[PDB]
Amino acid sequence: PITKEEKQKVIQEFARFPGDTGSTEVQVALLTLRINRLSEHLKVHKKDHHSHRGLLMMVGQRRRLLRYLQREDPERYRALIEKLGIRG
Amino acid sequence: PSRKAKVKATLGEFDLRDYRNVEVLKRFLSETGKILPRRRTGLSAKEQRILAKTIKRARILGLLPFTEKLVRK
Amino acid sequence: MRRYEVNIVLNPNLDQSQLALEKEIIQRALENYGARVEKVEELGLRRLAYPIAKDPQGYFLWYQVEMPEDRVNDLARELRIRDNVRRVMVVKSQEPFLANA
Amino acid sequence: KRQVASGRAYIHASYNNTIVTITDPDGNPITWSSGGVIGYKGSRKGTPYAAQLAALDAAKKAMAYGMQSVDVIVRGTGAGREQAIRALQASGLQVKSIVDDTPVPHNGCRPKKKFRKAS
RNA sequence: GUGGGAGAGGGUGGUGGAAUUCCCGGAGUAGCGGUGAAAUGCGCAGAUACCGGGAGGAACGCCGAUGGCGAAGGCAGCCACCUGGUCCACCCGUGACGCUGAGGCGCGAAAGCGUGGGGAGCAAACCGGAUUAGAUACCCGGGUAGUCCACGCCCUAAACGAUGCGCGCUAGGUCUCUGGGUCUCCUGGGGGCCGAAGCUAACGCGUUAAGCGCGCCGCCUGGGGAGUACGGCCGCAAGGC
Ligand SMILES: [K+]
Ligand SMILES: [K+]
Ligand SMILES: [Mg+2]
Ligand SMILES: [Mg+2]
Ligand SMILES: [Mg+2]
Ligand SMILES: [Mg+2]
Ligand SMILES: [Mg+2]
Ligand SMILES: [Mg+2]
Ligand SMILES: [Mg+2]
Ligand SMILES: [Mg+2]
Ligand SMILES: [Mg+2]
Ligand SMILES: [Mg+2]
Ligand SMILES: [Mg+2]
Ligand SMILES: [Mg+2]
Ligand SMILES: [Mg+2]
Ligand SMILES: [Mg+2]
Ligand SMILES: [Mg+2]
Ligand SMILES: [Mg+2]
Ligand SMILES: [Mg+2]
Ligand SMILES: [Mg+2]
Ligand SMILES: [Mg+2]
Ligand SMILES: [Mg+2]
Ligand SMILES: [Mg+2]
Ligand SMILES: [Mg+2]
Ligand SMILES: [Mg+2]
Ligand SMILES: [Mg+2]
Ligand SMILES: [Mg+2]
Ligand SMILES: [Mg+2]
Ligand SMILES: [Mg+2]
Ligand SMILES: [Mg+2]
Ligand SMILES: [Mg+2]
Ligand SMILES: [Mg+2]
Ligand SMILES: [Mg+2]
């Protein structure tokens, strides 16, 4: 799944500054994480349709953010994407 | 109606998550291995749900009865 | 690692020879899958509520371990071959939820 | 003439008839009676009365093998089931203990239409 | 975000006992079965009832609720792994990043279609037995598709709360599921019942609105003709929109 430890690493190496647990940058990071996890989960269990929904919800929940960012700080944006390998 | 004084009361404190305490567990089955209904067991939706759970386990471990022949009819 | 519990009921009609041998198989295969002994109980023989494998009685073993989840099932599939091993039930440990305390 | 003494008497209540079977201390039948055996045919066979004699006609055939005591075991719900149980009691035979053991399944086979609106 | 919670939410592998059928053995006779009453059917090649053994398939008794989960369709034996949603507390990070949502895309009970496998029980069609004025039926005896699994199609429904989604506002009482607290009680989320104000053609609704408001979508415009014809798009077909 995602051990309390595992999740920090992400945040840590993302939080725009100490205690930053909840900034667009961060959020997107974790989303991605989860998303990727689930995705490979659906590489198998192609019939786990109920889990698949959650995927879309995530994916969209992500775009709604990315969209925000890119519109607000077009730089923080490029930054973030250029890091995850998201979109191509 | 039921005038038999629920189980629980006639019992100490135990772990409902214990699928090996035959002596205590056993106490929750009817003459037949049937899992006693709350109106008798004397627990809560939450307990009565954790009970049945462990009981079923014990059975697989062959420590409790799936069913019993009713004596005297 | 995840804390489990490996209940094992094996043939009652044995002896310190094979019986020991089974532990000398079981106890091995465990470590062959990363099994980690935390505490073992051996209530030995007892009268099953219903006959399992024709016989009306079983020898119960117990093994509280902390092995690698990814191979739990792999551990059970294996432990099952032993013909004397008539029942295997692994179940991740939970804190004992008491009632009427 | 094998001599039995003690034994088992299985009652089989059906809504259509009531076979009663007597067997040695552990399975293996000895004698038995039905509703036709005695004499009836159609729905007659089930009548609690038939159930009676049925238990009885199976009572004698039993004593003849040297029957004295019996463990009664009932199966299925049906007319005169209690009759039979009641018969065997006043059959001159020793009725050790009645015990119901009807076969109830933990739900597995789809029942005939006739037994589903009930299910 | 951190820290707790409940759950038949989904996918996979495994596994348990009850029962039905069948095969093997015993023991054992003359019936069984089924109905309103019967008959077809089964049984001396030995059935039904009983006992022990095996094989197989499908469904999980009690627990079980007026209960729980899900977006819907729907989801109950047990275990492990993978995985989704959700609730409470703390009020810690972001700083309006929000709501709705044409088209699109995905999901979607049952039956049905394609390929392969499986096939205990049940059973359209079907073959018989009864019934009746007749019986292409209801009852009874058999029985193929199908029902079960994999993969791929089908996309419909009284797909119902016959009630689109989101937010704010407006008495309470009571029962309940689940979390937190200073735990005769307060507070949060969910499931019910009764009822304030109000609404409603009425029945009824009534903080789980059908009340008072705002935003966005879908839809309606007298019956029949007809969910038909034509056209298009979709489908292997049946058919669907
Ligand atoms: K319900
Ligand atoms: K057309
Ligand atoms: Mg700015
Ligand atoms: Mg004949
Ligand atoms: Mg077969
Ligand atoms: Mg709902
Ligand atoms: Mg429904
Ligand atoms: Mg979760
Ligand atoms: Mg703050
Ligand atoms: Mg600030
Ligand atoms: Mg939307
Ligand atoms: Mg749409
Ligand atoms: Mg189907
Ligand atoms: Mg098919
Ligand atoms: Mg006919
Ligand atoms: Mg007529
Ligand atoms: Mg009519
Ligand atoms: Mg028929
Ligand atoms: Mg049939
Ligand atoms: Mg479908
Ligand atoms: Mg209407
Ligand atoms: Mg209320
Ligand atoms: Mg409390
Ligand atoms: Mg409430
Ligand atoms: Mg009123
Ligand atoms: Mg009024
Ligand atoms: Mg009301
Ligand atoms: Mg018109
Ligand atoms: Mg029309
Ligand atoms: Mg019209
Ligand atoms: Mg149509
Ligand atoms: Mg075409
Ligand atoms: Mg049609």
Swiss-Prot record, chain A:
Part of the 30S ribosomal subunit. Forms a bridge to the 50S subunit in the 70S ribosome, contacting the 23S rRNA. It comes from the Bacteria. It comes from Thermus thermophilus (strain ATCC 27634 / DSM 579 / HB8). The keyword Iron does not apply. HAMAP family: Ribosomal_uS15_B (MF_01343_B). It holds the Pfam family Ribosomal_S15. SMART domains: Ribosomal_S15 (SM01387). One of its GO terms (molecular function) is structural constituent of ribosome. Transmembrane segments: none annotated. InterPro entries: Ribosomal_uS15, Ribosomal_uS15_bac-type, uS15_NS1_RNA-bd_sf. One of the primary rRNA binding proteins, it binds directly to 16S rRNA where it helps nucleate assembly of the platform of the 30S subunit by binding and bridging several RNA helices of the 16S rRNA. Keywords: Ribonucleoprotein, Ribosomal protein, RNA-binding, rRNA-binding. Disulfide bonds: none annotated. GO terms for biological process: translation. GO terms for cellular component: cytosolic small ribosomal subunit. The keyword Ribonucleoprotein applies. This is Small ribosomal subunit protein uS15. Belongs to the universal ribosomal protein uS15 family. The gene is rpsO.
Swiss-Prot record, chain B:
This is Small ribosomal subunit protein bS18. It comes from the Bacteria. Located on the back of the platform of the 30S subunit where it stabilizes the close packing of several RNA helices of the 16S rRNA. Forms part of the Shine-Dalgarno cleft in the 70S ribosome, where it probably interacts with the Shine-Dalgarno helix. Part of the 30S ribosomal subunit. Forms a tight heterodimer with protein bS6, also interacts with protein uS11. Binds to the C-terminus of IF3 and to the central section of Era. It comes from Thermus thermophilus (strain ATCC 27634 / DSM 579 / HB8). One of its GO terms (biological process) is translation. GO terms for molecular function: small ribosomal subunit rRNA binding; structural constituent of ribosome. Belongs to the bacterial ribosomal protein bS18 family. Keywords: Ribonucleoprotein, Ribosomal protein, RNA-binding, rRNA-binding. GO terms for cellular component: ribonucleoprotein complex; ribosome.
From Swiss-Prot, chain C:
Disulfide bonds: none annotated. Located on the outer edge of the platform on the body of the 30S subunit. GO terms for cellular component: cytoplasm; ribonucleoprotein complex; ribosome. One of its GO terms (molecular function) is small ribosomal subunit rRNA binding. One of its GO terms (biological process) is translation. It comes from Thermus thermophilus (strain ATCC 27634 / DSM 579 / HB8). This is Small ribosomal subunit protein bS6. It comes from the Bacteria. Part of the 30S ribosomal subunit. Forms a tight heterodimer with protein bS18. May make transient contacts with protein uL2 of the 50S subunit during translation. Transmembrane segments: none annotated.
From Swiss-Prot, chain D:
PROSITE patterns: RIBOSOMAL_S11. One of its GO terms (biological process) is translation. The keyword Cell membrane does not apply. GO terms for cellular component: ribonucleoprotein complex; ribosome. The keyword Iron does not apply. Residues 109-119 have a biased composition (Basic residues). GO terms for molecular function: rRNA binding; structural constituent of ribosome. Located on the upper part of the platform of the 30S subunit, where it bridges several disparate RNA helices of the 16S rRNA. Forms part of the Shine-Dalgarno cleft in the 70S ribosome, where it interacts both with the Shine-Dalgarno helix and mRNA. NCBIfam families: PRK05309.1, uS11_bact. PANTHER family: 40S RIBOSOMAL PROTEIN S14/30S RIBOSOMAL PROTEIN S11. Part of the 30S ribosomal subunit. Interacts with proteins S7 and S18. Binds to the C-terminus of IF-3; however exactly how IF-3 interacts with the 30S subunit is unclear. May contact the C-terminus of Era. This is Small ribosomal subunit protein uS11. The gene is rpsK.
